[PDB]
Ligand binder design. Sequence first.
Ligand SMILES: C=CC1=C(C)[C@@H](Cc2[nH]c(/C=C3N=C(/C=C4/NC(=O)[C@H](C)[C@H]4CC)C(C)=C/3CCC(=O)O)c(CCC(=O)O)c2C)NC1=O
Ligand SMILES: C=CC1=C(C)[C@@H](Cc2[nH]c(/C=C3N=C(/C=C4/NC(=O)[C@H](C)[C@H]4CC)C(C)=C/3CCC(=O)O)c(CCC(=O)O)c2C)NC1=O
Ligand SMILES: C=CC1=C(C)[C@@H](Cc2[nH]c(/C=C3N=C(/C=C4\NC(=O)[C@H](C)[C@H]4CC)C(C)=C\3CCC(=O)O)c(CCC(=O)O)c2C)NC1=O
Ligand SMILES: C=CC1=C(C)[C@@H](Cc2[nH]c(/C=C3N=C(/C=C4\NC(=O)[C@H](C)[C@H]4CC)C(C)=C\3CCC(=O)O)c(CCC(=O)O)c2C)NC1=O
Ligand SMILES: C=CC1=C(C)[C@@H](Cc2[nH]c(/C=C3N=C(/C=C4\NC(=O)[C@H](C)[C@H]4CC)C(C)=C\3CCC(=O)O)c(CCC(=O)O)c2C)NC1=O
Ligand SMILES: C=CC1=C(C)[C@@H](Cc2[nH]c(/C=C3N=C(/C=C4\NC(=O)[C@H](C)[C@H]4CC)C(C)=C\3CCC(=O)O)c(CCC(=O)O)c2C)NC1=O
Ligand SMILES: C=CC1=C(C)[C@@H](Cc2[nH]c(/C=C3N=C(/C=C4\NC(=O)[C@H](C)[C@H]4CC)C(C)=C\3CCC(=O)O)c(CCC(=O)O)c2C)NC1=O
Ligand SMILES: C=CC1=C(C)[C@@H](Cc2[nH]c(/C=C3N=C(/C=C4\NC(=O)[C@H](C)[C@H]4CC)C(C)=C\3CCC(=O)O)c(CCC(=O)O)c2C)NC1=O
Ligand SMILES: C=CC1=C(C)[C@@H](Cc2[nH]c(/C=C3N=C(/C=C4\NC(=O)[C@H](C)[C@H]4CC)C(C)=C\3CCC(=O)O)c(CCC(=O)O)c2C)NC1=O
Ligand SMILES: C=CC1=C(C)[C@@H](Cc2[nH]c(/C=C3N=C(/C=C4\NC(=O)[C@H](C)[C@H]4CC)C(C)=C\3CCC(=O)O)c(CCC(=O)O)c2C)NC1=O
Ligand SMILES: C=CC1=C(C)[C@@H](Cc2[nH]c(/C=C3N=C(/C=C4\NC(=O)[C@H](C)[C@H]4CC)C(C)=C\3CCC(=O)O)c(CCC(=O)O)c2C)NC1=O
Ligand SMILES: C=CC1=C(C)[C@@H](Cc2[nH]c(/C=C3N=C(/C=C4\NC(=O)[C@H](C)[C@H]4CC)C(C)=C\3CCC(=O)O)c(CCC(=O)O)c2C)NC1=O
Ligand SMILES: CCC1=C(C)[C@@H](CC2=N/C(=C\c3[nH]c(C[C@@H]4NC(=O)C(C)=C4CC)c(C)c3CCC(=O)O)C(CCC(=O)O)=C2C)NC1=O
Ligand SMILES: CCC1=C(C)[C@@H](CC2=N/C(=C\c3[nH]c(C[C@@H]4NC(=O)C(C)=C4CC)c(C)c3CCC(=O)O)C(CCC(=O)O)=C2C)NC1=O
Lengths: 164, 164, 164, 177, 177, 177, 275, 40
Amino acid sequence: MKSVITTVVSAADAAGRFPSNSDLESIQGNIQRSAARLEAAEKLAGNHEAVVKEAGDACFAKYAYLKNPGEAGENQEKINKCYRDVDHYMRLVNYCLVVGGTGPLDEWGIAGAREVYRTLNLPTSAYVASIAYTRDRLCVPRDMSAQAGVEFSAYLDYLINALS
Amino acid sequence: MKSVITTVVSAADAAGRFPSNSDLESIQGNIQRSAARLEAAEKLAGNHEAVVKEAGDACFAKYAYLKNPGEAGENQEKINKCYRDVDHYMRLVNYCLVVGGTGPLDEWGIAGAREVYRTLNLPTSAYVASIAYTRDRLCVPRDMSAQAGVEFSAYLDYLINALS
Amino acid sequence: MKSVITTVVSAADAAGRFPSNSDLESIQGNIQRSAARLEAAEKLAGNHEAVVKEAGDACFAKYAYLKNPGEAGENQEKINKCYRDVDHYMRLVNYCLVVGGTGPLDEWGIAGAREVYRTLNLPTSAYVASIAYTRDRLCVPRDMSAQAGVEFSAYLDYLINALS
Amino acid sequence: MLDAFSRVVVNSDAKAAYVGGSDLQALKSFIADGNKRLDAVNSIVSNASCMVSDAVSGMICENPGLISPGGNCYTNRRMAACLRDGEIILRYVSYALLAGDASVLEDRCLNGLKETYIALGVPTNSSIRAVSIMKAQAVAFITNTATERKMSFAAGDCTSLASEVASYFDRVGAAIS
Amino acid sequence: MLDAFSRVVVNSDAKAAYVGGSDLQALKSFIADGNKRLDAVNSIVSNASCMVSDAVSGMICENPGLISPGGNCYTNRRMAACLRDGEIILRYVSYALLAGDASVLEDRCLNGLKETYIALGVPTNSSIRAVSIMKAQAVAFITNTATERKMSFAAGDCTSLASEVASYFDRVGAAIS
Amino acid sequence: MLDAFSRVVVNSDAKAAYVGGSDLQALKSFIADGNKRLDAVNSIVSNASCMVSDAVSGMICENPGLISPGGNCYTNRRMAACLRDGEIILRYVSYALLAGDASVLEDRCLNGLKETYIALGVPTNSSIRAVSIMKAQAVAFITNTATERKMSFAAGDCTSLASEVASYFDRVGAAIS
Amino acid sequence: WDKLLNTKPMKRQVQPNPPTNETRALNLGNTFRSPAFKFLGTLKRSKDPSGLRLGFYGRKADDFMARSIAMQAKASAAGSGVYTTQCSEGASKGMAENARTASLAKQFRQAQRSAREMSFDYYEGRKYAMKAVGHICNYEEKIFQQYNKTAAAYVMGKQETLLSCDRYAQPANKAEEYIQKSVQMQMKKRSIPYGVYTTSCADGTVKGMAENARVAKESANFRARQMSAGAKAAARFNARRVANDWHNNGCNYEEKLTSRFPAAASSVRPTTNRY
Amino acid sequence: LTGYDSKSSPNFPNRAATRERRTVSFNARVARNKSQAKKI
Ligand SMILES: C=CC1=C(C)[C@@H](Cc2[nH]c(/C=C3N=C(/C=C4/NC(=O)[C@H](C)[C@H]4CC)C(C)=C/3CCC(=O)O)c(CCC(=O)O)c2C)NC1=O
Ligand SMILES: C=CC1=C(C)[C@@H](Cc2[nH]c(/C=C3N=C(/C=C4/NC(=O)[C@H](C)[C@H]4CC)C(C)=C/3CCC(=O)O)c(CCC(=O)O)c2C)NC1=O
Ligand SMILES: C=CC1=C(C)[C@@H](Cc2[nH]c(/C=C3N=C(/C=C4\NC(=O)[C@H](C)[C@H]4CC)C(C)=C\3CCC(=O)O)c(CCC(=O)O)c2C)NC1=O
Ligand SMILES: C=CC1=C(C)[C@@H](Cc2[nH]c(/C=C3N=C(/C=C4\NC(=O)[C@H](C)[C@H]4CC)C(C)=C\3CCC(=O)O)c(CCC(=O)O)c2C)NC1=O
Ligand SMILES: C=CC1=C(C)[C@@H](Cc2[nH]c(/C=C3N=C(/C=C4\NC(=O)[C@H](C)[C@H]4CC)C(C)=C\3CCC(=O)O)c(CCC(=O)O)c2C)NC1=O
Ligand SMILES: C=CC1=C(C)[C@@H](Cc2[nH]c(/C=C3N=C(/C=C4\NC(=O)[C@H](C)[C@H]4CC)C(C)=C\3CCC(=O)O)c(CCC(=O)O)c2C)NC1=O
Ligand SMILES: C=CC1=C(C)[C@@H](Cc2[nH]c(/C=C3N=C(/C=C4\NC(=O)[C@H](C)[C@H]4CC)C(C)=C\3CCC(=O)O)c(CCC(=O)O)c2C)NC1=O
Ligand SMILES: C=CC1=C(C)[C@@H](Cc2[nH]c(/C=C3N=C(/C=C4\NC(=O)[C@H](C)[C@H]4CC)C(C)=C\3CCC(=O)O)c(CCC(=O)O)c2C)NC1=O
Ligand SMILES: C=CC1=C(C)[C@@H](Cc2[nH]c(/C=C3N=C(/C=C4\NC(=O)[C@H](C)[C@H]4CC)C(C)=C\3CCC(=O)O)c(CCC(=O)O)c2C)NC1=O
Ligand SMILES: C=CC1=C(C)[C@@H](Cc2[nH]c(/C=C3N=C(/C=C4\NC(=O)[C@H](C)[C@H]4CC)C(C)=C\3CCC(=O)O)c(CCC(=O)O)c2C)NC1=O
Ligand SMILES: C=CC1=C(C)[C@@H](Cc2[nH]c(/C=C3N=C(/C=C4\NC(=O)[C@H](C)[C@H]4CC)C(C)=C\3CCC(=O)O)c(CCC(=O)O)c2C)NC1=O
Ligand SMILES: C=CC1=C(C)[C@@H](Cc2[nH]c(/C=C3N=C(/C=C4\NC(=O)[C@H](C)[C@H]4CC)C(C)=C\3CCC(=O)O)c(CCC(=O)O)c2C)NC1=O
Ligand SMILES: CCC1=C(C)[C@@H](CC2=N/C(=C\c3[nH]c(C[C@@H]4NC(=O)C(C)=C4CC)c(C)c3CCC(=O)O)C(CCC(=O)O)=C2C)NC1=O
Ligand SMILES: CCC1=C(C)[C@@H](CC2=N/C(=C\c3[nH]c(C[C@@H]4NC(=O)C(C)=C4CC)c(C)c3CCC(=O)O)C(CCC(=O)O)=C2C)NC1=O
């Protein structure tokens, strides 16, 4: 996991040490901006079927070569698995708005992503660019609050950053 | 040093990793309660000559055996060094209200305190009990604000805890 | 004409001697040089109809006063002399790249040059304002090879020290 | 390791000074710019995988002498080891821009950084060129003067942080030259 | 004359011996830098029209007694002399760096000019000063540490061999007077 | 005399400058290898009996014409003065090493010594054979390459000052011909 | 065509559809190295030491305190005055003079490391010394990032007087020793990165020390399960004290792999000493 | 550059070959311009 609980209660154990006031201070920043963090979570829970479909053929507009046989998108059975694949990325980013850090991303959906995809001849360049479509796809005083998009947008360009 | 900067920019280096939003969250709790933390600092800066004298012979009331020759308080030259000794503890606790954690305490005035004192035949039981006099010596809606004493009092019983 | 072969036998005619073993590792110095030398020469011939224009307009992108009345570049039949006279300078460069010396420069283009530019009121540094734009325009793996760019730019160093 | 809440105390411990309210207004200005520093450093790590890729492409754009064979930086392990060292300095300056203080810059890489490079045969003129690109894109992201990428902010002056990152890569660049 | 290869002949001629296995680590040492020895000899003769023009102008603009009326650079004859009279010294070190030894620098120009500059007037203050302005600029070109023009080369160290160009001036320095 | 701190300070008089941060690290590059140099001074002075006496005993059985009638090692007026003219160059290179500079070394014993040695009838090629043997025992104390008599020192290579004692040995080789 | 003295710099024209003309400019391209100036008796050129090069006085300082760091940490092994049984450096037959030549080969092969692995091990040991100490100081890492033998004798010294090393924590079943074996295979794969075998697992020079190195470990493998019942019980709690906190941060799967299999997480050896 | 070239002007010392010559034109050919180089 990955949160501020994974920082300070682990470092006090790594020092063999009490939860001193360095550790008690670090979780106060959760409290004053969990209200900032957790109206973003029900947006992509409310749009969990809305923006998966608008990101797939926005990716498949700029990656339209896949439909030949012998590639990653040779039939609709691939595309039926492909909207599963962006949503499984989209599940975890919703959960990282709850745990604070990128907890469910790294130990489940990020580490060893660069041992899988082109071995299964899946293009990694379409994977970041489907996400980079949704990275700029926001409008901060109109969709959500202004205190909600800066947790959302910093996780989506991280998904291009973590594949780097 | 010891602060939340010593947690998250060091753990991201210990992971070989970016300052992700786990690290950016942990310092927000500094900001909302630095105003809670930093009207306590000018109290013991305003009383930096007031409560050193009231703690020495409150300790020397309950430790009045020292004035014989051959011990830790055999002359006034020891007592002239003894008000230096409580104030040098009192300097660092003032600084830990500024850095957030117990930064100037552990690397300067805490570690290896249990290799010094009774080797110099200085009683460690009088050292915690001079501090434990000042630990309960507070009045939270009257001396300072109510948001200021809980950083102060948690550092003073820590001084008995860190000598344990 | 100054070349790499004219130094060898005009010294040996002044020596009164045969071509020794000493005289022929300029010729082993020739053929190790002449492999990656002449790749620069034919590459200039596939671009030069633009290159004497694209470096030729740069002196008019530096010194706009030549198009004034009473001056050298005052009308169109005098401006096509200025593209006549700059193509003949860069026709002597690929001749200088073949022979591996400097002799075609120092007889047809440099010898007697600066005595006629004074009398015909032509600027002696507007020519080197033009082939300075030939010098920075190289990106070394793309236009040339990685070593052939420096051996082409070393003849641009000769002619700007001939007029300046 | 050390930060702006600890730089203010460490000189005062050389004179054994109680900290008062004669220097805390520098820190009251520092705790003023809490979210303002935080609205700077998120924009650095938003796109810094693009910043590593922009720098060592543009450093190769000015100099193809590395990619030539027999050069320092030309093959595929060598570029991956180049992309290693290209990230690790951007990782470190974001810590000091978080700290407000470049003590964490100094001890963790810059102790003998300069001439491990010539112990490896690494050209130090190419190093200061690449981090100058990383200087130049970093101020465009903590302002809103990128080409396409305009993050969401609230308006106001951020040049005091732009001078703080201006005092950072050159401290590396003088420690590698 | 003697080059860097003819240095080890004559003292081993003086020992009445052969070119043995002792100097093999020097006559492999000049074999290795001959790519970048020849790359360094090109760097001085490329810029030498700007180099001697900068060397007289920096000497004149800080010492205005050379533009004294009736002085050493007052007339157009005496100004066009010194543009040549300090350029041949720049030309003679361009052969001496290529040979790897300054054995040519004594028997061609340093035999005489200490007692020849005073023999028609040229003093000791600015002729020593005319070399040092060329000296800190000759180290800049071979290290690619100029201010205004960056030469596109490979990656490597140049404190070893650029050195030779300074060295070839000891010769023009002491005994320029 | 301008010693080896002061040879760069006189050029700041010539360049109208101060001593700044430019040679501030290069002035104490002289310093940290200095007790390395000061350990390498005294053992040459400890064996000042041999290094004048071997440099003529290596010119008796290497030049049999010198002890012959006509040669300059014949009479005991000359043979006593063979080492009175020989002990000068032994003490002045220890003057050169502890001062570090050589500015005073080429006028206190080199301004004059050529034009008297044409008047005393000196084979000058044999006189540089009389100092080449003297050059090859000075390495045997400062690098401890003595196959006859060692001295105890601190283990660490002092190869930067190996031929800098020998760099003045070839200046008198040109100043006698 | 004809000029006037009027001031219209300001002003524009508006007819700037101006997507029709695009323009640029340049400037740059000028590195600088600080070179020494004033000249005789001197000329210096940059040299490759491929080492610490932070002073001759600093280099001879650096091996003395790390000897004192090892002798500090030999005095926690012998806190109570025992040469404790986890440290083994031999066989049945005497052969520690033969294992002197094993360790002086390791004193020599680490000295004849090439310039990549001499310099990589300087920086990975600096961040591992940050991982080796638990606390965050003004002192300890301010030795351990300038000096590297001190960092190297701390990641060896502090870690050997806990019991999270190789061959000391005993697995319970066949299931624990097999993934203990499998994580050692990637530590072979680290020190043997490709088809060349490295110089640094060479563990021998002569025919006598070839098979002496095999029977040295098999006596030391027995002395894990021989020595105690509580110190080896303290090993399985100690094995999480190196892996959970500074080796696999963020991976819960790699965190419960330690707490379900401590002896398998004890020869994971992520201190990259090329062994 | 000054002219076309920059060559050695013949009013320098050591501007000759001076190898197996006569006695009257050795010390005329060596010591070319010592008429003022020493006399001052
Ligand atoms: C969590 C991610 C997430 C999303 C991005 C949206 C996806 C989305 N956004 C918009 C809403 C939109 N609203 C605008 C209007 C705007 N006015 C301005 O001043 C700005 C320039 C711009 C803010 C983007 C635009 C341009 C779109 C996208 C185009 C569209 O209407 O479909 C709509 C159309 C219906 C609606 O208006 O709500 C949809 C389906 N839903 C989600 O759950
Ligand atoms: C940082 C530590 C620190 C301190 C503790 C004080 C020390 C201190 N506190 C008090 C102030 C005090 N005020 C009270 C009154 C009180 N009324 C109540 O309802 C409570 C029971 C109680 C709160 C303690 C009492 C009992 C004392 C201590 C006795 C005294 O007056 O000296 C006084 C007397 C002058 C004054 O009133 O301010 C002094 C010198 N100063 C310091 O700088
Ligand atoms: C919970 C974590 C989780 C993820 C992060 C994703 C990632 C992911 N996708 C696939 C697997 C796949 N992912 C895709 C998707 C695509 N291929 C493309 O080129 C398009 C860009 C995109 C569609 C929009 C396809 C088509 C497959 C099937 C590949 C195949 O079977 O050949 C697999 C292999 C196992 C599987 O089939 O699920 C994994 C781990 N899936 C997950 O379960
Ligand atoms: C900056 C950090 C810092 C500290 C935390 C203290 C702690 C401390 N006190 C003393 C040293 C001392 N401390 C005391 C004080 C006392 N003895 C008692 O039994 C009483 C309880 C108390 C007086 C109220 C005395 C009397 C000495 C002198 C001991 C001696 O010299 O014999 C020393 C030894 C060096 C010195 O003399 O300063 C140290 C480290 N002093 C510091 O400089
Ligand atoms: C064998 C090789 C060879 C050359 C190198 C050239 C050199 C050259 N150029 C010109 C002649 C000229 N050259 C220019 C050129 C210029 N004036 C400018 O404003 C610019 C600075 C520059 C062009 C960019 C002009 C304008 C003339 C005409 C002179 C005149 O009008 O009297 C002439 C005189 C004869 C003529 O008018 O054509 C010659 C010999 N010609 C050659 O045959
Ligand atoms: C025979 C030698 C020879 C050259 C020197 C170049 C010169 C040159 N460059 C371009 C055209 C170009 N040339 C470059 C190259 C560069 N621009 C830079 O900023 C870098 C210095 C450099 C390497 C990256 C670029 C980027 C263009 C596109 C437009 C432009 O910027 O000029 C063109 C137009 C046609 C073409 O693209 O080929 C020509 C003739 N081409 C040649 O055939
Ligand atoms: C010929 C090779 C060549 C390249 C590869 C590019 C690379 C490149 N980019 C910039 C300069 C820059 N580069 C970026 C980077 C980016 N801007 C974005 O919007 C993206 C997020 C990101 C690209 C991944 C930024 C923000 C600047 C500052 C100026 C600008 O906005 O373009 C510079 C100049 C740095 C400086 O000012 O010193 C260079 C060389 N340009 C070139 O000439
Ligand atoms: C965990 C994530 C996290 C963040 C990202 C910040 C988020 C954040 N930024 C600002 C607010 C701001 N941030 C900036 C800074 C900038 N604005 C720009 O246009 C420049 C690009 C940049 C300069 C570096 C400015 C100028 C304000 C407005 C300050 C104000 O309105 O008072 C505010 C309002 C509070 C305030 O500062 O007054 C908040 C909450 N805080 C957090 O806790
Ligand atoms: C082999 C190498 C070689 C040389 C070094 C020169 C040596 C030399 N210098 C001068 C001659 C001179 N040299 C200078 C030079 C200078 N005055 C200054 O103030 C500056 C310090 C300096 C220029 C940088 C001057 C002023 C004259 C005299 C010109 C005159 O007499 O009018 C002359 C007389 C002939 C003439 O003037 O043309 C000669 C032979 N020639 C050679 O062949
Ligand atoms: C009054 C007389 C006087 C001296 C003799 C020197 C004595 C001297 N030598 C060195 C010290 C040294 N000296 C040498 C030098 C050498 N080692 C060799 O084997 C070579 C023979 C020689 C030249 C390479 C070295 C390598 C060191 C250690 C460098 C260091 O101190 O870090 C030191 C400093 C540290 C130490 O004690 O080792 C001192 C004081 N200083 C003086 O004041
Ligand atoms: C000979 C060289 C030498 C060093 C470089 C230091 C480093 C060092 N410190 C400790 C020992 C320690 N180090 C600390 C660390 C700290 N205490 C704090 O409060 C700070 C936050 C932090 C940095 C100063 C603590 C608390 C101990 C005692 C408990 C432990 O062993 O971890 C040990 C283990 C053995 C011992 O106790 O000495 C070592 C090697 N000590 C040495 O003997
Ligand atoms: C059975 C014992 C056992 C462990 C204690 C861990 C620890 C560990 N991980 C890796 C190797 C790896 N470990 C991870 C794991 C992670 N990277 C992340 O980004 C996450 C935070 C984290 C948990 C998901 C990844 C992605 C690799 C492959 C890349 C690498 O070599 O680091 C290796 C090298 C070889 C190997 O894969 O075993 C080891 C010992 N793995 C194990 O097999
Ligand atoms: C530097 C390469 C090297 C060596 C080591 C020795 C090799 C060696 N080690 C020894 C012996 C040896 N080995 C150890 C183990 C280990 N080491 C310690 O200093 C402590 C406290 C340890 C416990 C973990 C101990 C305790 C001894 C016993 C004597 C001693 O070192 O104090 C003995 C003699 C004992 C006997 O006679 O059988 C030798 C010759 N020689 C070398 O060239
Ligand atoms: C279990 C205690 C133990 C050892 C350690 C080795 C020590 C050892 N290694 C050998 C032989 C050996 N030793 C190594 C070194 C080392 N071993 C590896 O398998 C890899 C990948 C290594 C470097 C990291 C290699 C690579 C070989 C070659 C194996 C082979 O080709 O058969 C041999 C065979 C000598 C012979 O008889 O020919 C011995 C005795 N043996 C043991 O009994």
